[PDB]
């Protein structure tokens, strides 16, 4: 409900409305103690799944999860040198392939990229002002088609 009211004031300013900059919302009325709402977004999946496929045969997936666990109780910081920055060498980023292999139509590809980037800037700032956390990859949802990243319910 708050986000919709935020979107309301990212408008009526001439400059952002003219740049198609804003944020995606829901409606999501809960029903009772279990609720469950609706509004599954069409033509979208999850950022997690996209990445799992892109990185499916490059180095090791679960091992990254293990290093992020094993180091939790180690001394001080340290782990960043000992492992995080070593793991970092991994395979280098692959997300760009999502778009290149999905939209081989240069004019549309180009517009989707602009959409994608603007949609991150608006995400970051509003989330920052609100002071939102979690996300944890799974609450990050990337639409295809236009490429606009959206959030799903955040706590």
């Amino acid at each position: 409900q708050v986000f919709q009211q935020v979107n309301k004031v990212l408008q009526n300013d001439k400059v952002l409305r003219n740049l198609d900059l804003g944020i995606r919302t829901y409606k999501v009325v809960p029903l009772g103690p279990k609720a469950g709402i609706i509004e599954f977004v069409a033509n979208s999946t999850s950022l997690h799944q996209i990445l799992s496929k892109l990185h499916t045969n490059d180095k090791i997936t679960f091992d990254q999860a293990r290093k992020g666990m094993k180091a939790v109780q180690t001394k001080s910081n340290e782990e960043r040198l000992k492992a995080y920055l070593k793991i970092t060498n991994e395979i280098k980023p692959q997300l760009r392939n999502f778009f290149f292999d999905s939209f081989p139509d240069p004019l549309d590809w180009f517009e989707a990229k602009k959409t994608y980037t603007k949609g991150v800037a608006a995400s970051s700032i509003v989330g920052y002002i609100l002071g939102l956390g979690d996300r944890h990859l799974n609450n990050i949802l990337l639409d295809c088609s236009t490429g606009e990243p959206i959030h799903i319910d955040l706590g």
Binding site: K14, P106, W109
Partner: protein, 892 residues
């Protein structure tokens, strides 16, 4: 025939006709038929040709001659010998296998008898004048019977006379499909060459109609529209007579309730009447009587009929407020609308209203620009509604194709949509060629079938259900297809593959004039020729047949993809695609292929060809002709810390996406950053830097364009410091804006293609006289600007400009009866407030100031010729200025 009837090295005549043995080979089929026809005149010279022949020595007579052997007449006895079929499968061989021979015979038999005689032949041949036949007979009866007996020429036709009716009688089981194909075959042949023998076509068409009982109501709409020729007054007279009969026939049948024929009737009638303001009275009744059929929307058609006959009137609606009947589909039916507006009717005035956009808006701007010759009234109507129009605002197939194995059938789906619609009849042979191909193909696919051969797929897709509706009958016969076109033969052998590398796909400076109009076709033919080596039945032939067709380009993407199923990977052009200094479009075509050739590697069905492709390099060409794909072509090979300043060029190629700001600018030179600060967006610091540099070095370094400063200076709100920075100096080209903003004027007239402010400037600056007739002069400026709009210096702005010109009128149009004047002002102010809801208060400023300015000019030119209105003009100017300020502070 003249050479055949000789025995003294008669063939030697060919030496001149050719301007060797090849001269006879060139029409060998005709010669074979001629020998058979010669019959009594057959001789050793014919035997010599038979000796030259192989299987054909017997087989051509047994097959090729049959295509038109009957057309030669050569006595009933000769026909009987052919029927004897000494070397062929009896009657089936020259009947079932040659229904199309009827057309060849019909042409040979085309007596083109004077109507007085033709009518008698018809009395026997089309006995009883059965309704539509009576109407057709009536059309024949309207003739002056000015036929030349001499038209017979070689005159098998004269002999055919009405005797031909008995020959026609040899036929059986007449069907729609036969009529359908015959009409288009002849229609296209008769659409070309000299009009000298046009009468023969008319007679042939009448005979075709007389012979056919097939009149399945709405089914006949295609006839009406395909025959809409009237290319010449002589042709038009014949066409009108036939058309009158056709309209009468629809009425005679009390059916054929066809509405979507009418826009292709009236566009042509009304075009015909331009200059040639005459029309047959039998036609006039044939069409006027349709008024009461009431099978149509009527209102739009009612106006068309009154426009033709009398009292066009309809100022109340047809003149402007009538619904856009064309706000559906039809593309060029808008021609009728535009014409009707120009015809009679009235000047567009007093707002009109007509709040319709949607489809109308789409169609107006869809195919756009059909008005090669239409103007008056319509241009004003259009411009008046411009605001309302403005207020209105492939990979899936590729992916499927690349998801398939050797499944060329996808081409048939492309072919079907193409001939079904595409131009929706542009009055060309293309329709005919495509229909013929489709007919052959379907007959194969659900006929011999057996192997899918990708043909049967049409049935699997149910494409065949529609395609066969008027086809897949009395055809097949690749040999007949070979008569329809000489293609599906040597052309493929000649096109080859290496030959393209050596010509069509060679630098080929000589082909520079061929380009997309022909070099591309040659390359496509070669692709087909190579594919043909292991191609499916029908498909090889179809590709060759269409080779001479126009704009069939997409077929090549598919064909190329399929021919590269081969392990050979010749590629060739791919390896040296950069030398492109002869013509443009072959470049663009190669780029399109380069894109789809990449897409397949995201499926990774076969990528060795992409890997072997030269990276970058050709990229510079892609840059010169500027695709946006350059970001992919450049970024994907890079994705690292490496720069390369071609990057700057790419961003410059798009002006700016607010991307240039991210370039790795931090220079080692203090002050060189001014080169960046001056490029984008900033409204103040960039001013200071440009001024600082000027003072720092202008000394003697006066060569620096002052434009970086002039730009900053004007955007910052100065005018008083800009006219004096770059006065008579080179610097920009939009100076009129400054003189417009100020009261300076005095920059002559921008007759040399105006844009935006220049148009506004033009309209006021060149407007003489204190009101009075000055308004008409102002209207003339609107028309002038519209024509500049047709240049189209830029997109959209011109529509806005027309609106703005319209804004000057109306208010400037009413010094007369200055009562309602205050409401005019209120209306325009409110409209402006809405306009400003979108688009920043920047470019719009000139419109607002210009409106102010015109009111001041009119109030200044006036004194006392005028009574009272100058008071209203001066006041209007002051009030508007107040509103200018209010909008400016609100958004500016």
């Amino acid at each position: 025939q003249n050479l055949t009837e000789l025995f003294e090295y008669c063939k030697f005549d060919l030496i001149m006709y050719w301007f060797h043995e090849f001269l006879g080979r060139y029409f060998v089929e005709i010669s074979a038929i001629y020998f058979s026809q010669g019959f009594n005149q057959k001789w050793i010279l014919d035997m010599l040709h038979a000796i030259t022949g192989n299987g054909d020595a017997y087989l051509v007579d047994n097959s090729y001659y049959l295509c038109i052997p009957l057309a030669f007449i050569s006595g009933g006895v000769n026909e009987l010998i052919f029927d004897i079929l000494p070397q062929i499968s009896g009657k089936t061989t020259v009947k079932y296998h040659k229904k199309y021979r009827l057309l060849m015979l019909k042409w040979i038999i085309r007596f083109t008898d004077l109507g007085s005689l033709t009518e008698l032949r018809s009395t026997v041949e089309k006995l009883f004048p059965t309704s539509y036949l009576s109407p057709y007979l009536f059309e024949n009866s309207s003739v002056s019977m000015r036929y030349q007996y001499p038209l017979h020429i070689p005159l098998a036709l004269g002999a055919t006379l009405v005797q031909t009716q008995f020959a026609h009688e040899k036929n059986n089981t007449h069907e729609f499909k036969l009529l359908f194909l015959s009409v288009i075959t002849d229609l296209e042949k008769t659409s070309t060459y000299i009009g000298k023998l046009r009468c023969a076509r008319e007679l042939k068409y009448l005979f075709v109609l007389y012979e056919n009982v097939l009149v399945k109501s709405s089914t006949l709409n295609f006839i009406i529209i395909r025959l809409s020729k009237f290319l010449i007054d002589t042709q038009i007279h014949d066409e009108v007579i036939t058309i009158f009969s056709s309209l009468l026939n629809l009425a005679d049948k009390n059916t054929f309730e066809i509405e979507p024929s009418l826009p292709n009737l009236f566009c042509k009638i009304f075009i015909y009447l331009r200059e040639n303001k005459q029309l047959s009275p039998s036609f006039q009744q044939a069409i006027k009587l349709l008024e009461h059929r009431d099978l149509i929307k009527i209102k739009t058609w009612k106006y068309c009929l009154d426009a033709i006959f009398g009292n066009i009137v309809q100022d109340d609606i047809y003149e402007n407020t009538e619904l856009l009947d064309a706000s559906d589909c039809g593309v060029d039916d808008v021609v009728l609308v535009s014409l009707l507006f120009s015809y009679a009717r009235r000047p567009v005035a007093s707002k009109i209203g007509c709040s319709l956009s949607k489809a109308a808006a789409i169609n107006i701007l869809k195919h756009h620009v059909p008005k090669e010759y239409l103007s008056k009234n319509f241009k004003l109507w259009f411009a008046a509604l411009s605001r309302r129009i403005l207020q209105q605002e492939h990979l899936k197939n590729f992916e499927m194709v690349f998801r398939h194995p050797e499944q060329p059938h996808m081409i048939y789906q492309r072919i079907s949509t193409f001939n079904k619609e595409a131009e929706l009849y542009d009055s060309t042979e293309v329709f005919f060629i495509s229909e013929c191909i489709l007919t052959y193909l379907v007959g194969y696919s659900i006929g011999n079938s057996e192997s899918e051969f990708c043909f049967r797929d049409n049935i699997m897709n149910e494409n065949k259900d529609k395609v066969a509706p008027l086809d897949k009958d009395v055809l097949n016969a690749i040999y007949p297809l070979a008569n329809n076109f000489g293609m599906e033969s040597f052309i493929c052998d000649t096109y080859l593959s290496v030959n393209e590398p050596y010509n069509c796909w060679l630098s080929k400076f000589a082909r520079s004039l061929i380009h997309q109009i022909s070099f591309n076709i040659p390359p496509i033919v070669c692709l087909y020729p190579l594919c043909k080596g292991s191609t499916a039945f029908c498909e090889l032939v179809l590709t060759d047949l269409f080779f001479l067709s126009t704009t069939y380009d997409p077929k090549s993407c598919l064909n190329w993809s399929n021919r590269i199923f081969t392990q050979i990977a010749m590629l060739l052009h791919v390896k040296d695609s950069e030398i492109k200094l002869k013509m443009l479009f072959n470049v663009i075509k190669m780029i399109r292929m380069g894109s789809r050739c990449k897409e397949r590697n995201c499926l990774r069905i076969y990528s060795s060809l992409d890997l072997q492709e030269i990276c970058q390099i050709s990229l510079k060409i892609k840059e010169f002709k500027f695709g946006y794909l350059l970001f992919e072509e450049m970024n994907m090979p890079n994705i690292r810390e490496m720069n390369i300043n071609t990057l700057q060029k790419i961003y410059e190629c798009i002006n700016d996406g607010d991307f240039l700001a991210g370039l790795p600018v931090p220079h080692s030179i203090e002050g060189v950053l001014n080169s960046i600060n001056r490029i984008d967006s900033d409204t103040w610091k960039r001013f200071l830097f440009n001024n600082a540099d000027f003072d720092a070095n202008y000394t003697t370094s006066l060569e620096e364009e002052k434009e970086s400063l002039i730009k900053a200076t004007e955007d910052s709100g100065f005018y008083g410091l800009t006219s004096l920075l770059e006065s008579r100096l080179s610097g920009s080209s939009d100076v009129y804006k400054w003189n417009l903003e100020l009261g300076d004027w005095k920059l002559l007239t921008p007759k040399v293609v105006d844009s935006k402010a220049k148009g506004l400037y033009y309209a006021i600056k060149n407007l003489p006289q204190d009101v009075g007739f000055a308004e008409k002069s102002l209207e003339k400026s609107l028309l002038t600007i519209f024509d500049s709009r047709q240049h189209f210096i830029s997109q959209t702005e011109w529509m806005d400009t027309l609106n703005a010109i319209i804004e000057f009128i109306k208010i400037a149009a009413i010094p007369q009866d200055v009562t309602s004047f205050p409401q005019t002002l209120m209306s325009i102010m409110k409209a402006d407030k809405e306009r400003l809801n979108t688009i920043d208060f920047y470019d719009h400023k000139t419109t607002l100031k210009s409106r102010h300015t015109l009111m001041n000019v009119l109030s200044r030119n006036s004194l006392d010729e005028n009574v009272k209105c100058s008071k209203y003009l001066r006041l209007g100017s002051i009030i508007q200025l107040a509103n200018y300020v209010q909008l400016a502070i609100a958004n500016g």
